[PDB]
Amino acid sequence: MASETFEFQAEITQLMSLIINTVYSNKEIFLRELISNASDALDKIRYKSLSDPKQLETEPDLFIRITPKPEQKVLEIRDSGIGMTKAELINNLGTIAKSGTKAFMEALSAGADVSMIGQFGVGFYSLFLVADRVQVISKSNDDEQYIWESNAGGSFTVTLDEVNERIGRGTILRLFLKDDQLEYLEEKRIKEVIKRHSEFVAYPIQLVVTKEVE
Amino acid sequence: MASETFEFQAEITQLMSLIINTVYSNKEIFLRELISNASDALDKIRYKSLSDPKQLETEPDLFIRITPKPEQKVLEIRDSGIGMTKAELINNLGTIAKSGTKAFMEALSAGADVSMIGQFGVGFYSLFLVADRVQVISKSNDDEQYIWESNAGGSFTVTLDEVNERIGRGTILRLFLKDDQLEYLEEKRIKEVIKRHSEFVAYPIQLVVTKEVE
Numbered sequence A, B: 001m002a003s004e005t006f007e008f009q010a011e012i013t014q015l016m017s018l019i020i021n022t023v024y025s026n027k028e029i030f031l032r033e034l035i036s037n038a039s040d041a042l043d044k045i046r047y048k049s050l051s052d053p054k055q056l057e058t059e060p061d062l063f064i065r066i067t068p069k070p071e072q073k074v075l076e077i078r079d080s081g082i083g084m085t086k087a088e089l090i091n092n093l094g095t096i097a098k099s100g101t102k103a104f105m106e107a108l109s110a111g112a113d114v115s116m117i118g119q120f121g122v123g124f125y126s127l128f129l130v131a132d133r134v135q136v137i138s139k140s141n142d143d144e145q146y147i148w149e150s151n152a153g154g155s156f157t158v159t160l161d162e163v164n165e166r167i168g169r170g171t172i173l174r175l176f177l178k179d180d181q182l183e184y185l186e187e188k189r190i191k192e193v194i195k196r197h198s199e200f201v202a203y204p205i206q207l208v209v210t211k212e213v214e
């Protein structure tokens, strides 16, 4: 109970401003980046489990799952990857300077394509193209479940999780989509962009659709 | 944190034994009863909201939703009805003698059909036909979210909810299905039985299916 606030490294809060206020037209690349991160966290736990099998027991199923929640205008990208501890959330998701942050921005300025973001190692923030608020719910075998939240301001909060479903292991990227990005709540659109830029994913990508029984 | 244990009224733990160990063949009637209860809790909040509109604000959408969770061999029936407080869970779901409990059993003995259960006012326990463990996660506007759990023994537990997703208002019936009742995790089967016995439900019945993107 009760959150802790942290300030974002100055260049990182710069990137977010840049991304959130970026009339860019190829916004669909955010799914590519998030699915890509999901697959990377699944690789880690798998590789890591090569000499530590028990690590898998917390969730034997390796997968990636997208769940749109229309009523809340939310879209969630989930994975049963290695997950992150509270330290790593605070550490890697905000307070510590990141290698490619400044470079990408300059590249972006020189006319670079926003889809290069992933090549600069800061693709997670691409999510701010379609969303104006996000929660990173994560659970690592080495710690408890926590919620990392941000609205692209200058500070972010980390809270012990007591309000969300329990994920065996992994992360959930809960994106509160912009009022004009609701198209990513639609099954067709989602399926469309997953096929366009995510053909070589090694884990099953599951889409959760809700339908009224006729 | 930390659960409280309660004993079941003696006749009620009798009914459960009777139901769980009942070779009956028309087990699909459990969905009828649970959907029926869902629709009843939705009626209450609606009616009740006739003179207390704000009561709806906690969850403006009236609906019923079934979500099978294969990996956990779980099936959930959810509704955004009036929900129940901790008192009512302890009170109405176990400790207080119920009017039709003894009568149904006798009727069942005289050769009655198990699907009459709902007519005796004890249809909730029909769920024990396909499941051997259940959790009633509920949240009423008049209280906090709690988890009521049972395995058909002689006692049940009520715990303040800190491990499940937050439901605006309503109840979730999390049924841990029997090893031979997994057929209710299948979309076809589910859709089949909903159409068979639940044609006159006034609220949208939503089915949540998970599928791998081709």
Ligand SMILES: COC1=C2C[C@H](C)C[C@H](OC)[C@H](O)[C@@H](C)/C=C(\C)[C@H](OC(N)=O)[C@@H](OC)/C=C\C=C(/C)C(=O)NC(=CC1=O)C2=O
Pocket: A036, A037, A038, A040, A041, A044, A079, A081, A082, A083, A084, A088, A089, A092, A093, A121, A122, A123, A124, A125, A136, A171, A173
């Ligand atoms: C090759 O490694 C990658 C890294 C290094 C990273 C910090 C190491 C990290 O340690 C804490 C874990 O190894 C790893 C399991 C987790 C993630 C990918 C997360 O994905 C999920 N589902 O867990 C993502 O979660 C919202 C979090 C931060 C990502 C940043 C700032 C980014 O923008 N780009 C990157 C993409 C990568 O794949 C990146 O920097």
Ligand SMILES: COC1=C2C[C@H](C)C[C@H](OC)[C@H](O)[C@@H](C)/C=C(\C)[C@H](OC(N)=O)[C@@H](OC)/C=C\C=C(/C)C(=O)NC(=CC1=O)C2=O
Pocket: B036, B037, B038, B040, B041, B044, B079, B081, B082, B083, B084, B088, B089, B092, B093, B121, B122, B123, B124, B125, B136, B171, B173
């Ligand atoms: C006409 O009223 C009904 C009652 C009276 C009942 C105790 C009053 C109750 O007060 C606490 C609320 O008014 C009501 C909102 C909630 C429910 C139906 C629940 O459904 C959900 N989704 O909330 C069900 O939840 C697992 C709980 C207990 C049910 C029992 C023991 C039963 O087996 N049969 C009955 C079916 C009914 O519809 C029944 O007895």
